[PDB]
Amino acid sequence: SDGDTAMKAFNDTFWDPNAKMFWKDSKREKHQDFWVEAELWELVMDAYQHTSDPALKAELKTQIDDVYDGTVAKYGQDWTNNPFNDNIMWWAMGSARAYQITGNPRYLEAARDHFDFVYDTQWDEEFANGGIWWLNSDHNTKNACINFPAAQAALYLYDITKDEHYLNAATKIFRWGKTMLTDGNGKVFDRIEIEHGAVPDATHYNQGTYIGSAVGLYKATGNAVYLDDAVKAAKFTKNHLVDSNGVLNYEGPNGDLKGGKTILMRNLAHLQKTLDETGQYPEFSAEFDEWLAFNIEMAWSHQNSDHIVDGNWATYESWSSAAAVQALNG
Ligand SMILES: *[C@H]1[C@@H](O)[C@@H](O)[C@H](O)[C@@H](CO[C@H]2C[C@H](CO[C@H]3O[C@H](CO)[C@@H](O)[C@H](O)[C@@H]3O)[C@@H](O)[C@H](O)[C@@H]2O)[C@@H]1O
C-alpha cells in the first residue's frame, strides 16, 4: 500500500527509538517541537487506521504508546504550564484519539484534564462575546489555531464520553469561531486581536481544523449546515491556497506553517469520507476527489530515493515531509 511505503520510510528516516520521538530533520540533532510531535502522533494513528498490512499495523499500534511515553519522559504528564493554549490543545486532541484506538484510561485522563483546563479557564466572553485566548500567560488575541482544534478535541471527548457538556462546548466554540474568525463564506482568519481586530490571513492548518470541527459537528448533530460550512471552507482552500496548477501551496519559511498541509490533508480526508457516505454536494464531491487525487499524485511524484517527500510538492525536515505521508493515509 502507498500509505505503507510512505509511513515506513518516514519512520526509517525520522523515528528515534531511543528517545521515542521523531527527529526534527535528517541531521538528527534535535527532536521535533512539542506541538508538531502531537501532529506526527496523529499521523501514526492515521497510518494505523489506514493500513491493511497486519505486521505494520501492530508495530504502528505500539508506536502510538511510544510517541506519548517519549514526550511524557521529556516534558512530564502535566502540560498546563505551557503558555500556549494551542500547545496544550494539540496534545489533548491527540490523547483523545489515542483513547479511541487503545482504550487506555491514561489517554482519556490526559485529554479531559488538558481540554478542561483550557476550556474552563481560557474561554472568555469579556472580549468579542466568546472564544479561547491564544495564551494563558497574556490575554491579547484569540486564534483559529486554538479555537478550531478545541472544538475538535471537544467533539472527540463527546464521542468518547457521550457527556453533552463536550458537545455544548464544541458547538459554542465553533459558532463563535465561524462568526468572529471567518468571513462567513469559508475563509478562516488567523486570529482576532484586542487592539487591531481580525487578521484575515488564511493558512492550510486553520482551513483544516475548521473543516474537521464542522464535519465532526455534522456527525454529532446531523445538522447539514455544518457540512455546508465544511464544503465552503474546502472550496476556499482548493481555489485560493494553491498554485496556478492547483497544487496546494508550500507555506514556508515559517516553521509552524511548513507542514500545515499535514493537518489540512487529515481533515480533508474526513470531509471526503463524509461526502462519500452521505451523497451530500455530489458535483463538488467529484471535483474535490479529482483535485485531492491530483495533489496526492503530485506529492508521490516528488519522493526521493528513500521515499521521503519534502513539503515543496510542485536536509529533509519531518514536519514538511509529513504532509505526503498523511496524504497517502487518508
Ligand atoms: C502555538 C504553539 O504551537 C507555538 O509553539 C507556536 O509558536 C504558535 C505559533 O502561532 C503563531 C504563528 C502562526 C503563524 O503566523 C504567521 O502566519 C500567519 C498566517 O499567514 C500570519 O498572520 C502571522 O503574522 C505570521 O506570518 C499563526 O498561525 C498563529 O495564529 C500564531 O500567530 C502556535 O500558535
Residue numbers in the entry: 39 to 352, 359 to 374
What did the paper state?
GH76 enzymes catalyse the hydrolysis of α‐1,6‐mannans, such as those found in the yeast cell wall, with net retention of anomeric configuration. In 2015 their 3D structure and putative catalytic itinerary were identified revealing ‐ in the case of the Bacillus circulans enzyme ‐ five enzyme subsites “‐3 to +2” (using the described nomenclature) with Asp124 acting as catalytic nucleophile and Asp125 as catalytic acid/base in a classic Koshland double‐displacement reaction. We show, notably through mass spectrometry and high resolution 3‐D structural analyses, how the disaccharide cyclophellitol is indeed a poor inhibitor, but how the trisaccharide versions, in particular the carbasugar‐stabilised one, potently inhibit B. circulans GH76. We used a more easily crystallizable variant, R341Q, designed to prevent formation of an intermolecular salt bridge due to crystal packing and allow ligand complex formation, but which is otherwise unchanged in catalytic machinery and efficiency.
